[PDB]
Design brief:
Subunit structure (chain D): V-ATPase is a heteromultimeric enzyme composed of a peripheral catalytic V1 complex (components A to H) attached to an integral membrane V0 proton pore complex (components: a, c, c', c'', d, e, f and VOA1).
Bound molecules: 1,2-dioleoyl-sn-glycero-3-phosphoethanolamine
Family (chain D): Belongs to the V-ATPase 116 kDa subunit family.
Number of domains of chain B: 1
Number of strands of chain B: 1
Largest sheet of chain C: none
Organism (chain D): Saccharomyces cerevisiae (strain ATCC 204508 / S288c) (Baker's yeast)
Coiled coil (chain D): 115-143
Structural class of chain B: mainly alpha
Chains: A mainly alpha (268), B mainly alpha (71), C mainly alpha (159), E mainly alpha (69), F mainly alpha (198)
Oligomer: part of a larger assembly
Subcellular location (chain D): Vacuole membrane
Number of domains of chain C: 1
Largest sheet of chain B: none
Order of helices and strands of chain B: HHE
Helix content of chain C: over 70%
Distance between the termini of chain C: 13 Å
Strand content of chain B: under 5%
Order of helices and strands of chain C: HHHHH
Radius of gyration of chain B: 19 Å
């Protein structure tokens, strides 16, 4: 009933209703993200689910309908918010202390002395509780949650773009594949996949030990358009030889997207 | 032993249960079980792995001037 | 007293702390009064829609809680002897959340006033207003994010 | 071999009906008890009054008007309305049942027209008395004052 | 009625949250007493919070009988 | 009137003051060069970041009630449009996102500088740039937001008339959106060579 508001689907195409059973409440819980506030939603809906026989017979208002019509939407927005809150490690603004920490303080210090922690290991599940109460805590989390958001929308978008293909292969529209699908794929994957592969690669390099300097990714993405062949800090070998190719490939896909299908119409 | 291989070793275990569940999903409402579970496990993995990789080789370490000397 | 710690430096924090609740209060008043007059016009003939049409009056009250959250965080970064780096941070934070919430607030009033009048005549038109009205309440938020990024850099490596 | 229609929409078929005029009225009840069929409009160019069953529909349109008049007088008073079995016809599961007669429907006409003639008079014989009343109370209240 | 359900569910979890809190002050958990601005004496604060939870427990059992009848 | 009288009574004091100093041999006393040098480059840099995300939110919030107040009126008779005409509320919100991407980029350039090297060639350069780049992105997205609201209030009224006409007016609504994307580019080019405060 959510997708049908936006539009009724064409005959025998992919329904937007199956992915929406999971992707609608999981995006909610990235934002909402707390074990306390989520445990409350879970109860508020779990009262509507168990008493549904009693509630359905009795008469209802206009607000109390939608809370009842979506009593299973709210159940999954609560369960997933207890998973995401556990990873963020936030329960009513406070933290849990389940596992050993990958950070270690000095053996000795004094009052008022700014102290820094030293690394030991990696924390298995979630954000380490050493960040809680810390002075520089947002600098870490803001960088973390941005890169989460960019990666989780690229996957949400590409997966929904492979539903175009699944339709064209069911209605036997071959030209639209070569016309629309294959050029548009290369356009964004070559630009916004290259960004997402570089975020995962930078996280997987010990920059300090190796001695090389970590590069900024906002500038790396800008200069490849404005000034190709140029680099200030290198991320991997042959970086410039690959960037200019990806720029070449995107610019080819523009007119190929523009011209290929009308010409087939004229030639019939 | 905590490394980028640790993320792959989970992806093998998770990219196999999706396969076994595809086979074993019941016939009644087969598409809802089959899509919902496979698509749930994946977004549970991607959000673990992102949260793990941001901690292997961090570039800034936590710093404070507020603790008690006793700790 | 010093080239890096003048005596007029707290002026930009105190004026920034004040201007965050001043500009967000004004917005939430334009959007409460304006909205509030449609509710007092439709519910003379349709009193059954009263509790459902207070939703614009809620959205503007949240605009004011944002400006209170920024006044509370910049206040505890103040001091007689603080740098001039710190003062202009405290300024831009208040000027961001304030100017952003003032604008969001006025839109909540104009759109919320029209929705309550229309939905009385077309009950399918309530959800259409609830959509349009979230894109205004989120602009007060985008100003709050800027204020928080800046406050982090306030007393970092200062001397 | 029933299909599931969640990943893609269900497959459909277009059917034709050769109904005799005798049993047209009876067949339409059964098709409505199912709740499976969506009819096209073949007579899409014909004007609304040139259609053929228009005369049968006014007899029934007039009756609904006469019933709206009744529900108004009720609500004008404090009477509550009886609520019968909403399931005696069906349970929504596509079950069969036999429809009314053509004579029963012709009785609703004369009855409903016969009731409108009485109530419309009984209300005006009531209101005119209340006008005489209100006039005298005002004539009475004024005299009470000194 | 709703005048009684409110303080029943409210005071339900006041018994739970305040007791979990008091347990932690008593055991001197780092997050609750670690910073200097936090209170100095752990168990003293727990003694004050064990009692506060009992006050909610009375409202819970009372309103339980009120709605139960 | 009164408000316009003051605009003409300011112009008359700036002139009588300029000629007092000039005829007396003191025209050098009105020196804009020192003001630009002696004022702190943190002032200019923290105005620009505020006037970018602030003036961008003014524009977005503006177009949302031109497009929003007409849809709701048009939606009384044609309630089917409020989800089809929703795309106009989306191009008006997005100019605010552009003003928030800048402030992410520019906030990185806010660093503490030594007292001896505060009024240097590079740190003055960096305050002047983040000021005019913020003005640029903010004042330009203010204009793209008001414009797209006007365009999208018509497309609501046309769609209620006839469903076909909605598509034809979107083309006008796309070209308007280009204005905000060009402003973002120009700002990044300004602050490309600017370096963090030393
Ligand atoms: C006629 C009086 C009655 C009317 C009163 C109404 C307000 C009038 C305006 C008041 C402000 C202007 C007069 C005060 C300026 C002089 C203060 C002073 O000496 O400060 C000096 C000192 C610098 O000293 P040195 O660098 O060592 O140099 C030697 C000194 N020359 O600088 C300062 O302290 C500057 C402070 C100026 C503040 C002026 C503004 C005050 C706030 C007014 C806000 C009005 C707008 C509303 C804001 C709304 C949003 C919150
Ligand atoms: C702002 C602060 C206050 C917030 C108060 C929130 C109170 C809780 C409200 C309920 C939230 C959970 C339910 C929402 C998800 C389910 C919605 C759903 O299924 O909608 C279906 C419905 C279509 O069918 P119906 O029109 O219901 O008719 C046929 C029904 N068989 O879907 C649509 O209309 C499409 C749009 C869906 C999303 C709409 C969400 C709107 C939420 C509005 C909240 C209003 C709160 C009012 C508070 C007043 C308190 C006195
Ligand atoms: C990085 C991004 C990672 C996520 C990408 C995931 C893409 C998955 C797409 C799956 C789409 C799907 O379900 O297709 C079903 C559809 C079947 O349709 P029906 O009409 O049921 O067939 C009738 C006859 N039996 O399958 C197809 O025909 C298409 C199959 C596509 C397989 C794609 C494999 C994965 C490709 C990854 C590429 C990644 C980027 C490079
Ligand atoms: C799943 C889909 C993955 C698609 C991207 C493939 C990237 C391959 C990365 C890789 O293997 O590089 C390793 C290797 C380094 O290995 P060592 O640390 O020396 O250790 C080797 C012995 N253990 O990498 C390098 O040498 C440098 C980094 C290379 C990055 C290349 C980036 C290519 C960009 C392509 C653009 C298109 C992206 C499409 C994404 C699709 C996602 C499904
Ligand atoms: C969103 C989650 C993304 C990450 C998880 C993806 C799972 C699927 C992985 C398939 C990747 C295939 C190509 C790369 C194979 C790499 C093989 C490998 O093990 O390389 C290890 C080696 C590191 O070794 P050490 O430095 O010794 O480890 C730490 C020591 N303390 O890896 C590297 O150097 C770089 C690896 C780059 C991985 C790139 C993966 C690209 C994924 C793109 C996803 C985009 C959307 C999100
Ligand atoms: C030294 C500093 C002096 C600052 C003076 C500020 C003057 C403000 C002028 C102004 O905007 O006037 C209000 C303006 C005048 O409009 P007109 O139609 O031209 O009115 C005359 C009609 N016959 O009207 C409005 O803006 C709307 C009404 C509310 C105005 C509120 C003004 C408050 C001014 C506070 C100044 C405090 C200074 C310290
Ligand atoms: C760095 C800061 C720079 C500040 C610059 C301020 C510029 C203000 C421009 C005002 C323009 C304006 O409104 O002009 C009004 C008026 C024209 O009025 P009409 O339309 O002819 O009236 C009859 C209509 N029926 O023109 C003028 O005021 C011209 C003189 C303007 C001088 C500047 C005024 C400065 C005011 C104080 C700023 C602080
Ligand atoms: C208020 C003053 C308005 C402008 C007139 C100035 C008259 C004046 O002072 O003339 C002498 C003054 C010299 O003064 P000092 O001894 O150097 O310093 C003391 C200054 N009081 O002369 C000058 O400096 C020349 C200034 C010329 C500016 C233009 C004056 C135009 C006046 C028109 C007025 C018309 C009536 C209203
Ligand atoms: C406008 C506000 C700023 C005006 C600044 C005027 C003073 C100034 O900066 O002068 C700089 C400089 C002189 O330098 P000094 O060292 O003083 O003399 C030369 C020594 N070898 O000025 C010039 O070169 C000439 C500039 C003249 C600008 C005009 C005067 C400013 C006011 C506007 C006047 C407009 C015409 C008025 C006509 C009135 C008729 C009723
Ligand atoms: C309560 C609220 C109060 C609000 C107050 C409002 C005030 C508005 C601004 C007023 C600024 C006035 C500045 C000029 C004052 C003045 O006369 O200065 C003269 C003074 C000379 O003094 P002496 O004692 O003669 O020096 C002797 C040296 N041996 O001049 C100087 O020294 C130079 C000063 C130059 C200042 C120029 C400032 C201009 C600023 C404009 C804004 C910046 C540009 C913005 C561009 C925006 C584009 C959209
Ligand atoms: C109609 C009539 C028009 C009349 C216009 C008259 C303009 C008068 C301008 C006067 C300028 C005088 C400049 C001057 O002399 O200032 C001093 C000083 C030089 O001092 P020195 O000689 O080195 O000192 C030696 C000390 N021993 O001047 C300079 O360095 C700066 C010169 C340029 C002045 C600039 C004035 C302000 C301009 C602001 C522009 C803002 C642009 C806004 C764009 C907005 C886009 C949206
Ligand atoms: C969605 C709403 C968004 C705007 C909310 C208000 C925010 C205001 C500040 C935003 C930053 C500046 C951007 C430009 C805003 C311009 C607004 C504007 O046009 O103001 C108009 C408005 C007049 O409106 P009316 O024509 O009377 O009423 C409407 C008739 N149909 O303008 C004014 O009131 C001008 C006031 C000028 C005062 C100048 C005094 C300056 C004093 C300085 C010290 C000396």
């Amino acid at each position: 009933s959510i997708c049908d508001c936006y539009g009724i689907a064409q005959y025998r195409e992919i329904n937007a209703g199956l992915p929406t059973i999971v992707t609608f409440p999981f995006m909610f819980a990235i934002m909402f993200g707390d074990m306390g506030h989520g445990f409350l939603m879970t109860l508020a809906a779990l009262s509507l689910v168990l008493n549904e026989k009693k509630i359905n017979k009795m008469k209802r208002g206009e607000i109390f309908d939608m809370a009842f019509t979506g009593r299973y939407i709210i159940l999954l927005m609560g369960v997933f918010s207890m998973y995401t809150g556990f990873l963020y490690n936030d329960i009513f603004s406070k933290t849990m202390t389940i596992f050993k920490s990958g950070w270690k303080w000095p053996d000795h210090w004094k009052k008022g002395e700014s102290i820094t922690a030293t690394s030991v290991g990696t924390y298995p599940i979630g954000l380490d509780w050493a960040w809680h109460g810390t002075e520089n805590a947002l600098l870490f989390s803001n960088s973390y949650k941005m890169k989460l958001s960019i990666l989780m929308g690229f996957i949400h978008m590409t997966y929904s773009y492979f539903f175009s293909l699944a339709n064209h292969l069911y209605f036997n529209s071959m030209i639209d594949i070569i016309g629309n699908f294959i050029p548009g794929l290369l356009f964004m994957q070559g630009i916004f996949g290259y960004l997402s592969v570089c975020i995962v690669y930078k996280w997987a390099v010990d920059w300090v030990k190796d001695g090389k300097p970590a590069p900024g990714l906002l500038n790396m993405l800008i200069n490849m358009f404005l000034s190709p062949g140029t680099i200030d800090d290198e991320l991997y070998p042959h970086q410039a030889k690959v960037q200019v190719f990806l720029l070449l490939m995107a610019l080819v896909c523009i007119p190929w997207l523009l011209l290929v299908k009308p010409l087939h119409f004229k030639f019939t | 032993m905590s490394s980028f291989y640790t993320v792959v070793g989970v992806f093998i275990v998770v990219s196999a249960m999706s396969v076994l569940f595809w086979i074993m999903a019941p016939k009644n409402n087969q598409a809802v079980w089959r899509s919902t579970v496979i698509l749930t496990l994946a977004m549970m993995f991607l959000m673990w792995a992102i949260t793990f990789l941001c901690q292997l080789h961090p570039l800034v370490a936590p710093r404070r001037s507020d603790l008690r000397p006793e700790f | 007293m010093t080239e890096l710690c003048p005596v007029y430096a707290p002026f930009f924090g105190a004026i920034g702390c004040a201007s965050a609740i001043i500009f967000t209060s004004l917005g939430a008043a334009y959007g409460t009064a304006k909205s509030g007059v449609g509710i007092c016009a439709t519910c003379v003939l349709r009193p059954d829609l009263l509790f459902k049409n207070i939703v614009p009056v809620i959205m503007a009250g949240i605009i004011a809680i944002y400006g209170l959250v920024v006044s509370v965080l910049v206040c505890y970064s103040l001091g007689q002897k603080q740098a001039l780096y710190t003062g202009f941070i405290q300024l831009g934070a208040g000027l961001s959340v304030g100017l952003s919430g003032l604008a969001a607030g006025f839109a909540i009033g104009i759109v919320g006033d029209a929705g309550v009048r229309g939905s009385s005549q077309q009950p399918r038109l309530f959800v259409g207003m609830i959509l349009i009205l979230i894109f205004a309440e989120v602009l007060g938020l985008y100003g709050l994010i800027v204020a928080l990024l800046l406050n982090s850099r306030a007393t970092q490596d200062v001397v | 071999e029933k299909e599931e229609a969640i990943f893609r929409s269900a497959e459909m078929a277009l059917v034709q009906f050769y109904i005799p005029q005798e049993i047209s009225r009876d067949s339409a009840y059964t098709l409505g008890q199912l709740g499976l069929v969506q009819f096209r409009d073949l007579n899409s160019k014909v004007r609304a009054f040139q259609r053929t069953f228009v005369n049968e529909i006014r007899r029934l349109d007039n009756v609904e008007r006469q019933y709206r008049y009744f529900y108004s007088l009720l609500k004008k008073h404090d009477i509550k309305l009886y609520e019968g079995d909403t399931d005696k016809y069906l349970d929504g599961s596509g079950e069969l049942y036999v429809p009314p007669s053509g004579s029963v429907i012709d009785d609703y006409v004369r009855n409903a027209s016969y009731l409108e003639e009485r109530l419309i008079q009984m209300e005006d014989a009531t209101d005119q008395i209340e006008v005489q009343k209100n006039d005298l109370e005002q004539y009475r209240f004024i005299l009470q004052s000194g | 009625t709703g005048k009684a359900w409110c303080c029943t569910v409210l005071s339900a979890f006041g018994v739970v949250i305040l007791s979990v809190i008091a347990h932690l002050f008593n055991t001197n958990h780092e997050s609750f007493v670690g910073s200097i601005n936090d209170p100095e004496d752990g168990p003293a604060v727990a003694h004050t919070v064990y009692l506060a939870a009992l006050v909610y427990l009375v409202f819970f059992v009372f309103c339980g009988f009120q709605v139960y009848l | 009137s009164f408000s316009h009288f003051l605009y003409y009574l300011v112009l008359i004091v700036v002139i009588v003051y300029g000629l007092y100093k000039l005829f007396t041999g003191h025209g050098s006393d009105i020196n804009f060069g020192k003001f630009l040098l002696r004022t702190s480059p943190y002032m200019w840099a923290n105005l620009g970041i505020a006037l970018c995300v602030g003036l961008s939110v003014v524009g977005a919030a503006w177009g949302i009630f031109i497009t929003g107040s007409s849809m709701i009126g048009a939606g009384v008779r044609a309630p089917r449009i409020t989800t089809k005409n929703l795309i106009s509320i989306i191009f008006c919100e997005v100019v605010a996102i552009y003003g928030l991407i800048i402030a992410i980029v520019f906030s990185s350039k806010l660093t503490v500088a030594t007292a001896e090297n505060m009024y240097s060639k590079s740190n003055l350069y960096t305050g002047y740039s983040l000021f005019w780049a913020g003005i640029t992105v903010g004042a330009s997205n203010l204009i793209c937001g008001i414009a797209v609201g006007i365009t999208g209030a018509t497309a609501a009224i046309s769609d209620a008339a006839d469903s076909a006409l909605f598509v034809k007016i979107l083309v006008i609504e796309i070209f308007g959106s280009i204005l905000g994307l060009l402003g973002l580019i120009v700002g990044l080019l300004m602050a490309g060579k600017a370096s963090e405060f030393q």
